[PDB]
Amino acid sequence: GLHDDAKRILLHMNGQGLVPSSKVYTGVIEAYGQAALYEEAVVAFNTMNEVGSRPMVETFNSLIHAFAKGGLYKESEAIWFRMGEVGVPRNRDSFNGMIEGYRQGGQFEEAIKAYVEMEKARCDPDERTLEAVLSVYCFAGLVDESEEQFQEIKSLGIQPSIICCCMMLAIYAKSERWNMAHELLNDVMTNKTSDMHQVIGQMIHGDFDDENNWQMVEYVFDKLNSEGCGLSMRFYNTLIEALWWLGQKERAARVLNEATKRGLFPELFRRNKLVWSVDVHRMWPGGACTAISVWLNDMEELFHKGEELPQLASVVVVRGQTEKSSITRDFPVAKAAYSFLKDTVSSSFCFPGWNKGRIVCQKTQLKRIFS
Amino acid sequence: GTEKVLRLVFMEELMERARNADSKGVSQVIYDMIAAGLSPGPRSFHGFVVSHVLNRDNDGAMHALRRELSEGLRPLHETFLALVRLFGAKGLATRGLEILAAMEKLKYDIRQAWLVLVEELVRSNHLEDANKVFLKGAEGGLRATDEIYDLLIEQDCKVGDHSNALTIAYEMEAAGRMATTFHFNCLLSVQA
Amino acid sequence: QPHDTPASQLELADPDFYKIGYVRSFRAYGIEFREGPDGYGVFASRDVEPLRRARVIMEIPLELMLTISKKLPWMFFPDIIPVGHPIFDIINSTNPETDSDLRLACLLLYAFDCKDNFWQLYGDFLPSDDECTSFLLATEEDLLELQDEKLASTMREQQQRALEFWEKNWHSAVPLKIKRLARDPERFIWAMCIAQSRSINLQMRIGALVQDANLLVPYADMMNHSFQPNCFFHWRFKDRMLEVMINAGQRIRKGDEMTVDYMAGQKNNFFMQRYGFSSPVNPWDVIHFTGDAKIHLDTFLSVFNISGLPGEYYHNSRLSNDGDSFVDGAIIAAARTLPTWSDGDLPPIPSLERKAVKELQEECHQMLAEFPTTSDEDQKILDSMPDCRRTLEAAIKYRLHRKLLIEKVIQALDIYQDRILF
């Protein structure tokens, strides 16, 4: 996920003289597709298309994932339409990235249509595809409907990973089912799954946090670097989602500290003389609320130390071409961000008139709630 | 209302950082302003281009040009003029014709840019490519100033090139300006 | 239904105006002369598509116009002054550098008193002493009303010089040949006004002699003025005929007003001094600023789409046409007269230009309040008088155009200060 080192390598290669190959730009568009650097990946792909090389399917399935990390569905539709005319087939990971991008965004209807298209094209849906199909019914109010895919996962293979178990637990906790979900919680803690899947579950239950007890989960936190930022950020996001909604807030939103010390959650907060904001464009509603609370207390703790307030404090919730639209409020994260900023704090944070894709507060207005 | 009020402070410090030839500051200001919801404009990218131009950075300038063009926004005339001047100062004549063609496809005028290109190629001790660019631009119906007509002839006669000097003199007399004693005198020097 | 064209508002001229010339070797191709309240004008009667070369619309022979050389040996190529006539002593006793309208006026007065001459029949179509817009035939009231001290002083000096020349040359002991030319001192003033408001300087060639002369050509003085002309004068030496040819590439439709350029590249003051004409879209009129604030030039030209070298500024429509309808000759003249600074490719700072624009605006406001009147008052005065003197109309239009230029500069500065931050 390194991006500055990628730029240094590209500069040294250009200084050498050798023209970068297909895989060079294919890795560059993935290094500039995990740090919210969406425009650099676009310009690198343009340079790839304007240097004398033909993009393969690997470049396309990397670009769909890089554009699905944020949630720009229009860019995904555009690149999917261009892949049809460029002359390449649509493999499994392409549909996987499309549905992953549609998940954090709106348009929940297109997911089942894309899956039935996979079935028509004999896409041979894999485990990630079935996980995505199960998550299709996750963000929506279809708690009891999201159980046939769980049974399919339990039958065709081993029990689903923790990123699905904790997700279903948070789904059950979102509805009016608190105590009936404790047995399903003990299920994942008293089963025959992997070794690390057993210690995960006791980190939320009980106290388990001190100078030595919370040091045990440090090994589990550092061992998951083998995924390569693919499912590690997904795992942390799902953990925060299942931890903050029903549990202790001080216990849930503390993993972000070690995550930022690790280097897997970049651009979560912007601090400068002119601007002071928070980017949650690649975060789920619960995680977005956790980051909002973290940024709020981090700004209020800097309020009494005598520091100049920013001219505009923004909350980057949704980006992309869709930003200038009235269809914005339909994003799942958006409804939750608006509710959390309306019920927790006063009515000082509102949508901008120039761009309806974030939440901003004026300088004088921020001072009033702070006091 | 407040849109221009905040754009003022967004652009003021950007230009102030671009004045002292600092590219990282302009880049971080661009990132901050695009994170604030406002799409970047051509005036803002002008500073990011001139930051690399002042630090003799050609690859960074090309990257900034591609960045500005990718968002479907046509660059301004001053940015293209600075790019042409930088490519002419470095002697990269072949990389200036593509910029001139890009200006032409954007319905601009490529007269002053072509003059700046030939002048910077002459001043950078690049005479052959300067004469080539001048002859390529003159055939398309683009006339030049008298000062360039005099400078090209003087330099080509001081170096010892008679063919290009005579061709430029013929093109000058065809454009409308007749030759004076100075011109003939230069040509005679090479002839004697 | 009749087609709505700028030429349809006027009526067709008298057919004798063209009949008195058609009997000579005069031709007019694709043109129609039309008279209105302001005067005659030349319009088009055929759609001229973009041509590769020029097309001739007038052929005016040499034997129909007057000509006096600009050098010391005064050679009148149309020989109408016989040797021994005492008018050559009046033409010759003049300074060969400062006064050239006196000789043309004397030649016109003599041509008005010579039989079988074209100007005895053409003089019926020249403007009289009441429909002429020249400031020589003006009063002290109108000159004081101009609100310009230097122009009024120059016009008074010129009137004095004309009167002194008439008093020194047309004395009592003069023979009758000269006395019958200009009996009253107003005739000579009118002759000078016609010779000054209708003269054309052109290098003509006859036989083997190539010289530059001042010639009063008929049927070509009717061409109006426009800073974006459509035609130009050309001399044909094989037949000794002057031509008015449309520019190559310009598209002319039916009803368009054929115009040429009078004194290309001059200030709006010399126009009022010579032709008694004022235009608010003059791209060369100068506005003097005493302040030290300096605006940026390249950004100012880029925001208004004024692309071109400092010698030739044009508005590039294909960059922005509908968006920039403000871009006229006024903004071009402003960009030429505004105090500008440029140091390489250094980008401008918004604070410096925002502090300079307010200084420029307050300077414009303090220089505009110097006039006793305002813009709306003069706008109401100009149409409050339906039929007034032509000199007063020209003066009030001059004042209105100056004020409108100042207002246009102020509005352009406002657009620049509010559009520099996209």
Look up residue C246 and give its two tokens: 């449309």
Q: What is the C-alpha to C-alpha distance for residues C136 and C377, in angstroms, rounded to an integer?
A: 26
Question: Using an 8 Å Cβ cutoff, are C110 and C81 in contact?
Answer: yes
Question: Using an 8 Å Cβ cutoff, are B52 and B90 in contact?
Answer: no
Asked if the Cβ–Cβ distance from A42 to B13 is below 8 Å, we say no
Alpha-carbon gap: B70 to the closest alpha carbon of chain A (Å):
7
Nearest by CB to residue B35, choosing from A11, A43, A316, is A316
Q: What is the C-alpha to C-alpha distance for residues A309 and A300, in angstroms, rounded to an integer?
A: 11
Q: What is the C-alpha to C-alpha distance for residues C127 and C189, in angstroms, rounded to an integer?
A: 13
Asked if the Cβ–Cβ distance from B35 to A42 is below 8 Å, we say no
Q: What is the C-alpha to C-alpha distance for residues A69 and A55, in angstroms, rounded to an integer?
A: 21
Chain B stretch 150-189, residues whose beta carbon is closer than 8 A to a beta carbon of chain C: none
Question: Using an 8 Å Cβ cutoff, are C333 and C285 in contact?
Answer: yes
B37 near A CB under 8 A: yes
* B29 contacts in chain A (CB < 8 Å): 274
Neighbours of chain A (3+ CB pairs under 8 A): B
Q: What is the C-alpha to C-alpha distance for residues B159 and B162, in angstroms, rounded to an integer?
A: 9
Strands C259-260 and C224-225: parallel
Question: Using an 8 Å Cβ cutoff, are B71 and B40 in contact?
Answer: yes
User: What DSSP designation does A110 have?
Assistant: H
At a CB cut-off of 8 Å and minimum separation 6, what does B97 contact? B133, B136
What Cα–Cα distance (Å) separates residue A290 from each residue in A239, A299, B36?
12, 14, 20
Q: What is the C-alpha to C-alpha distance for residues B104 and A163, in angstroms, rounded to an integer?
A: 55
CA angle C341, C344, C348 (to 5 degrees): 60
Name which of C306, C249, C284 is nearest C405 in CA terms: C284
B41 near C CB under 8 A: yes
B141: left (phi over 0), alpha (psi -120 to 50) or beta: left
In chain A, which residue's Cα lies nearest the Cα of B9? A274
Asked if the Cβ–Cβ distance from C307 to B109 is below 8 Å, we say yes
Is residue C212 helix, strand or coil?
A: strand
Count chain A–chain B contacts defined by CB atoms under 8 A. Answer: 52
For C39-84, give the DSSP string.
-EEEEE-S-B---SS-EEEEEEEGGGSEEEESSSS---SS--S-TT
3-state SS, one letter per residue, for C92-140: HCCCCCCCCHHHHHHHHHHHCCCCCCCHHHHCCCCCCCCCCCCCCCCCH
B54 near C CB under 8 A: yes
* A358 contacts in chain B (CB < 8 Å): 36-37
Q: What is the largest CA-CA distance in chain C?
A: 78
Look up residue A106 and give its two tokens: 């709106």
Name which of C346, C177, C198 is nearest C274 in CA terms: C198
* A311 contacts in chain B (CB < 8 Å): 6, 9
Nearest by CB to residue A43, choosing from B29, B59, B70, is B70
Name which of C39, C94, C37 is nearest C68 in CA terms: C94
How many CB atoms neighbour CB C391 within 10 A?
A: 23
Long-range contacts for C261-265 (Cβ within 8 Å, ≥24 apart)?
A: C261/C225, C261/C226, C261/C227, C261/C229, C261/C232, C262/C225
Nearest by CB to residue B37, choosing from A43, A272, A355, is A355
Residue type, B187: L
In chain A, which residue's Cα lies nearest the Cα of B67? A43
What approach was used to elucidate this structure? cryo-EM
Question: Using an 8 Å Cβ cutoff, are A76 and A108 in contact?
Answer: no
Q: What is the C-alpha to C-alpha distance for residues A78 and A313, in angstroms, rounded to an integer?
A: 32
Is residue C246 helix, strand or coil?
A: strand
How many CB atoms neighbour CB A363 within 10 A?
A: 12
Q: What is the C-alpha to C-alpha distance for residues C47 and C255, in angstroms, rounded to an integer?
A: 9
Neighbours of chain B (3+ CB pairs under 8 A): A, C
How many CB atoms neighbour CB A95 within 10 A?
A: 24
At a CB cut-off of 8 Å and minimum separation 6, what does C87 contact? C81, C106, C110, C177, C178, C181
Asked if the Cβ–Cβ distance from B50 to C351 is below 8 Å, we say no
Question: Using an 8 Å Cβ cutoff, are A174 and A336 in contact?
Answer: no
Q: Which of B6, B29, B59, B67 to mutate to test the interface with A (most CBs of A within 10 A)?
A: B6
Look up residue A168 and give its two tokens: 């279903």
Name which of A1, A93, A101 is nearest A318 in CA terms: A101
User: What DSSP designation does C236 have?
Assistant: E
* B41 contacts in chain C (CB < 8 Å): 422
Resolution in Å, one decimal, please: 3.0
Name which of B151, B133, B154 is nearest B142 in CA terms: B133
Asked if the Cβ–Cβ distance from B43 to C421 is below 8 Å, we say yes
DSSP strands (E only) in A225-322: 270-271, 276-279, 312-316
Strands C295-296 and C259-260: unpaired
Q: What is the C-alpha to C-alpha distance for residues A94 and A38, in angstroms, rounded to an integer?
A: 18
Question: Using an 8 Å Cβ cutoff, are A118 and A127 in contact?
Answer: no
Alpha-carbon gap: C120 to the closest alpha carbon of chain B (Å):
42
Phi and psi angles of residue C128, each rounded to the nearest 5 degrees, phi first: -80, -170
Phi and psi angles of residue C398, each rounded to the nearest 5 degrees, phi first: -60, -45
Phi and psi angles of residue B112, each rounded to the nearest 5 degrees, phi first: -65, -35
* B59 contacts in chain A (CB < 8 Å): 11, 14
The partner residues of C244 in beta bridges, in order of sequence, read: C58, C233
Look up residue A98 and give its two tokens: 């499309």
In chain B, which residue's Cα lies nearest the Cα of C350? B12
> Angle between the A255-262 and A232-244 helix axes, to the nearest 10 degrees?
170
For B65-132, give the DSSP string.
HHHHHHTT----HHHHHHHHHHHHHTT--HHHHHHHHHHHHTT---HHHHHHHHHHHHHTT-HHHHHH
Residue type, A252: A
For chain C, the residues whose C-beta falls within 8 A of a C-beta of chain B are: 298-299, 301-302, 307-309, 316, 318-319, 345-351, 354, 418, 420-422
Given the structure tokens 């001290």, which residue do they identify?
C149
Name which of A54, A5, A51 is nearest A27 in CA terms: A5
Q: What is the C-alpha to C-alpha distance for residues A10 and A8, in angstroms, rounded to an integer?
A: 5
Look up residue A229 and give its two tokens: 């930022």
